[PDB]
Amino acid sequence: DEDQVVVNKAAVMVHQLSKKEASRHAIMRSPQMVSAIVRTMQNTNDVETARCTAGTLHNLSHHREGLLAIFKSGGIPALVKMLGSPVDSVLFYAITTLHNLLLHQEGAKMAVRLAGGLQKMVALLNKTNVKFLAITTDCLQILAYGNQESKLIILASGGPQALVNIMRTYTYEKLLWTTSRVLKVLSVCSSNKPAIVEAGGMQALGLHLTDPSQRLVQNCLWTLRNLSDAATKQEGMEGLLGTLVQLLGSDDINVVTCAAGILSNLTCNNYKNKMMVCQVGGIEALVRTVLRAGDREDITEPAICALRHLTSRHQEAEMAQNAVRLHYGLPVVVKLLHPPSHWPLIKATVGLIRNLALCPANHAPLREQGAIPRLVQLLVRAHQDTQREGVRMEEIVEGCTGALHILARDVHNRIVIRGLNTIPLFVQLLYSPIENIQRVAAGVLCELAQDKEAAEAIEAEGATAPLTELLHSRNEGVATYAAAVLFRM
């Protein structure tokens, strides 16, 4: 084998040779002709030489030694350079060769990044050949995974919008999956996440939640869960929400887990989403989910959180509060206050009960199921733990006190609450440094004080003094409750 200086036609044979595997290892061992093969490719304007050269580099990318040749011959910047070509044949050869290097060649990742490979691959995402896009997106996945720097470059190059458009356009499974994996990798980056959401990533990913490919569905769910928390106010979420509710019935536990977590995130302080989730039967579905989950807290916790969002501050909140009871939900909710539940689940369950108790028809069943003494034990113990990371016991204090504040609207609950000797504790909570604890403490005292016997007990406990002080609280809610107890005393 020799080297041809000017006319292209040297390349139409070395390529035509490059198939004979016996010869390849000659080509593979000449740190002068690989270099020549490369040099020509980057420099010619003979489109056939371009594809003959690139095609040759491809064929060699199939061997451990073949990669090394191209690598230490500085082929990577050349290949990246070739990603700006019009010829679809050379585009395909270059990206495939890069793909093999990215997969098997030690040190290829860094060389591609250095060469401007990220920006060029992102720019190629507006192509229309699905096989080409599948390769290109997989390269991006390999480069971005566990490399925050690459993630930020993909974002700056317009990565998010381009990938989302792909998810909205194509049906080719391998491409949808490979693209979804890039999105998943980007979805944990604090900068990429809002951009993906901004590009309509959540609605786009939602399109594929009924696809028969489980790896595609699962990747879309993982990405959605990362994106969903603290998204902006998106519209066009109707379909996504309805599908998530359906997925709760799935036999796959990871589908059920993700669907619950996304619903929890999407309903948090979004009354439109709460309405829509309730309207497609979200309450019944979440209750059933909690029942089936048993003690798997990675399911119950977000499902309960979702239920808590769905039972407050939207048009059909009252209906949701009844609906939890009507679908046999009350006993299991109370049960989740007990071991083996961990703190995050207990905190969420207390908040749900607080909401359920806003519905008078839940007052008796919550009492009968034993919610009150368990809430009181949780409160007593949590207060002591404060008086001496994860979940803070102050949040359990405030939560339990708040649930009891609402339950105390019922005359029989007030009797049970008082009978558990809670008044001294409630009065002591008036001295809390936390305004929100002062408020619910003063609030529950206010409910109890409507019964003369309790009012005297509250007075006897020395409540006049801290209450009188709370009259001057910069927190108006605290001051207003404090005045009402003082009155009734």
Side-chain angles (χ1 to χ4, degrees):
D1 289 345
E2 293 177 350
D3 289 345
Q4 300 180 0
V5 297
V6 177
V7 177
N8 81 325
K9 224 195 62 174
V12 307
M13 296 159 183
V14 39
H15 174 215
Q16 213 254 313
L17 174 69
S18 64
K19 295 311 168 62
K20 181 163 170 71
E21 226 256 27
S23 69
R24 289 190 193 181
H25 297 62
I27 337 184
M28 212 162 306
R29 292 190 209 91
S30 148
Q32 358 180 0
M33 162 232 39
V34 188
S35 306
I37 298 171
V38 171
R39 171 174 48 243
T40 347
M41 185 185 69
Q42 191 173 183
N43 296 306
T44 182
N45 281 314
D46 177 77
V47 293
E48 296 83 2
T49 311
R51 54 165 307 271
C52 288
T53 28
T56 318
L57 301 187
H58 177 188
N59 306 319
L60 297 184
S61 63
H62 291 106
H63 314 278
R64 194 171 265 229
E65 318 166 64
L67 300 166
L68 274 181
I70 299 158
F71 185 51
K72 287 296 189 186
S73 137
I76 295 187
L79 296 162
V80 174
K81 190 128 285 184
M82 298 286 88
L83 298 177
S85 171
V87 190
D88 292 343
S89 185
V90 65
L91 275 187
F92 183 80
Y93 275 132
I95 197 67
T96 308
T97 313
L98 288 172
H99 190 235
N100 297 317
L101 293 163
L102 286 180
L103 284 174
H104 317 293
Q105 181 57 74
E106 180 189 336
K109 284 184 182 62
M110 218 56 223
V112 174
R113 299 183 181 112
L114 267 31
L118 290 167
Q119 298 82 347
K120 299 203 193 299
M121 290 169 181
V122 179
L124 291 165
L125 297 177
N126 71 334
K127 291 304 186 173
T128 54
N129 182 284
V130 301
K131 273 73 175 187
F132 171 76
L133 290 176
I135 308 299
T136 298
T137 51
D138 204 47
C139 289
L140 289 173
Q141 190 274 344
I142 295 169
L143 292 170
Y145 177 66
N147 200 273
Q148 184 57 28
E149 199 178 5
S150 297
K151 297 184 190 199
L152 294 179
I153 295 167
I154 292 160
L155 167 60
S157 304
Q161 191 62 70
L163 300 161
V164 165
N165 284 356
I166 284 172
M167 298 301 303
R168 285 198 289 223
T169 304
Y170 300 97
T171 64
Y172 186 58
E173 193 278 344
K174 187 172 179 285
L175 168 60
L176 294 172
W177 175 62
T178 300
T179 303
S180 71
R181 295 177 74 223
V182 183
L183 288 170
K184 184 179 72 65
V185 163
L186 300 181
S187 72
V188 296
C189 166
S190 56
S191 305
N192 274 279
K193 179 200 303 181
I196 298 163
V197 168
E198 180 191 8
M202 298 212 292
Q203 301 87 337
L205 291 161
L207 298 173
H208 303 277
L209 291 185
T210 49
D211 193 284
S213 175
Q214 280 315 287
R215 62 179 192 177
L216 171 57
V217 172
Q218 196 49 245
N219 265 273
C220 289
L221 285 174
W222 284 328
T223 308
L224 279 167
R225 182 174 60 187
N226 298 330
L227 297 177
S228 60
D229 180 0
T232 72
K233 303 151 147 294
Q234 289 295 313
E235 78 177 2
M237 302 281 287
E238 294 79 18
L240 173 51
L241 292 171
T243 304
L244 289 168
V245 171
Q246 292 299 96
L247 294 182
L248 289 174
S250 175
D251 288 308
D252 190 327
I253 275 313
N254 313 137
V255 171
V256 176
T257 295
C258 282
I262 302 159
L263 285 170
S264 173
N265 285 338
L266 287 182
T267 54
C268 186
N269 297 311
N270 190 310
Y271 80 93
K272 274 190 69 179
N273 294 348
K274 297 178 180 192
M275 279 287 290
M276 298 183 181
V277 174
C278 285
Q279 283 179 329
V280 299
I283 298 289
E284 177 192 338
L286 284 162
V287 168
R288 190 198 35 86
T289 301
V290 178
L291 288 167
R292 281 172 93 261
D295 55 12
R296 281 165 290 177
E297 296 184 49
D298 56 348
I299 306 185
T300 56
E301 172 191 349
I304 295 294
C305 281
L307 284 175
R308 185 196 45 187
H309 304 154
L310 293 181
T311 50
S312 61
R313 304 186 291 104
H314 68 99
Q315 210 177 266
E316 299 299 311
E318 170 179 323
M319 200 164 83
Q321 294 156 11
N322 281 289
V324 173
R325 181 188 69 259
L326 296 176
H327 293 285
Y328 310 86
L330 296 194
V332 73
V333 172
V334 179
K335 178 181 175 171
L336 295 182
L337 292 179
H338 293 81
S341 301
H342 293 67
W343 290 118
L345 176 56
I346 292 170
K347 168 186 165 188
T349 301
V350 172
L352 170 53
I353 291 171
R354 186 266 174 202
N355 290 354
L356 296 174
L358 294 167
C359 175
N362 285 342
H363 289 167
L366 287 169
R367 176 179 61 254
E368 295 165 350
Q369 292 301 311
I372 298 165
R374 182 52 185 155
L375 285 167
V376 166
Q377 295 294 351
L378 284 168
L379 167 61
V380 166
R381 177 55 54 172
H383 181 54
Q384 282 176 29
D385 295 353
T386 61
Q387 292 317 288
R388 76 205 184 177
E389 40 179 342
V391 177
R392 306 181 312 275
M393 289 306 104
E394 301 91 63
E395 316 191 272
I396 306 306
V397 172
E398 172 187 349
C400 294
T401 305
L404 291 168
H405 178 200
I406 312 296
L407 287 159
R409 295 169 176 185
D410 180 86
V411 64
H412 303 286
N413 294 344
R414 296 199 286 280
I415 297 183
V416 174
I417 289 165
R418 186 156 78 260
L420 289 159
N421 204 52
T422 48
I423 295 171
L425 177 52
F426 289 150
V427 167
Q428 193 57 37
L429 288 182
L430 298 180
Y431 297 99
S432 183
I434 280 67
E435 291 185 358
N436 287 338
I437 293 176
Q438 297 164 16
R439 197 185 65 90
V440 288
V444 66
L445 289 173
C446 179
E447 299 291 350
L448 292 173
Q450 81 190 273
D451 296 319
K452 228 300 161 193
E453 173 164 349
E456 305 184 359
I458 293 166
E459 183 178 19
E461 200 54 41
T464 301
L467 285 168
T468 317
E469 174 169 350
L470 287 179
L471 284 171
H472 310 306
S473 176
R474 56 160 48 240
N475 187 310
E476 175 176 325
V478 167
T480 318
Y481 280 143
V485 185
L486 287 172
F487 181 55
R488 291 177 189 171
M489 288 192 302

